[PDB]
């Protein structure tokens, strides 16, 4: 039972950690997309001012 | 247990480069924002 627990811990150290890193990368990509949307909104505001 | 410890050590060694890359990207973004402000 402890061996299965240690196997799950090793899985978390390996595949689950890699999946968590992929999730962090996806969150960073989403933040970059939000920044791009904010820049587009600023450009639209500049066009309205013009 | 020792095999998992070695796997964790190698995982930290490999993810250190990714963390450094993210920090470099953040620093570059701050510099780009400073340049765009000027």
Residue among A7, A8, A10, A15 with most chain B CBs within 10 A, to mutate: A10
Residue A50 has what DSSP assignment?
-
Alpha helices in chain A (DSSP H): 2-11, 17-49
Experimental technique, in short, is cryo-EM
Choose the closest CB to B11 out of A9, A17, A28: A17
Contacts of A4 (CB under 8 A, 6+ apart): none
Tokens coding B37: 């402000």
**CA B15 → CA A35, A45, B8, B12, B19, distances in Å?**
25, 40, 10, 5, 6
Residues whose CB falls within 8 Å of the CB of residue B12, separated by 6 or more in sequence, listed in order: none
CA distance A6 to A3: 5
């Amino acid at each position: 039972q402890a061996d299965a627990q240690r196997a799950q811990s090793d899985a978390l150290a390996k595949q689950a950690e890699a999946q968590m890193k992929q999730v962090e990368a996806q969150i960073r990509l989403a933040e970059i997309e939000l920044k791009k949307q904010e820049a587009v909104l600023q450009q639209r505001e500049m066009a309205l001012k013009e």
